[PDB]
Design a protein around this ligand. Structure first.
Ligand SMILES: [Ca+2]
Ligand SMILES: [Ca+2]
Length: 148
């Protein structure tokens, strides 16, 4: 498995500002042989399949069920909040070597089910934040979904 990461959402149309708040990851896969992991979360703002912004949170050295509660801000127009998708990706850090991909979640157009409901709930609450548990899925499949 990959695990599950909880993150919040908060759109402000009055100003046209998108907000993504990282909360915590759990059941994260072990990337270190017989050891722990160093998973962190990242956020990417894509336009119906077009990379626009890239963000990353702190790194929880040696762990698999760490907390974050980080607040990120984006600049998405009230007319784009529906055409954009916030992708929450969790990657494992490895000092020198490259960072392994634990998994990644996505919310927005291409999204569906609990993911689409969250993004929609966000727009429904253009003032109050929306937190929910997002189960990290295979990044490759995730990228395949965004691809039309
Ligand atoms: Ca590793
Ligand atoms: Ca590691």
């Amino acid at each position: 498995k990959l695990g599950d990461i909880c993150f919040s959402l908060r759109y402000v149309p009055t100003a046209g500002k998108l907000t993504v708040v990282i909360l915590e990851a759990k059941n994260l896969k072990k990337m270190d042989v017989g050891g722990l992991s160093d998973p962190y979360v990242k956020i990417h703002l894509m336009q119906n399949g077009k990379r626009l912004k890239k963000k990353k949170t702190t790194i929880k050295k040696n762990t698999l069920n760490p907390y974050y509660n980080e607040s990120f801000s984006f600049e998405v127009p009230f007319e784009q909040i529906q055409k954009v998708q916030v992708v929450v990706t969790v990657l494992d850090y490895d000092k020198i070597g490259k960072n392994d991909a634990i998994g990644k979640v996505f919310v927005g157009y291409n999204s569906t089910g609990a993911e689409l409901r969250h993004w929609s709930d966000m727009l429904a609450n253009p003032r109050r934040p929306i937190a929910q548990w997002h189960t990290l899925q295979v990044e490759e499949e995730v990228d395949a979904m965004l691809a039309v």
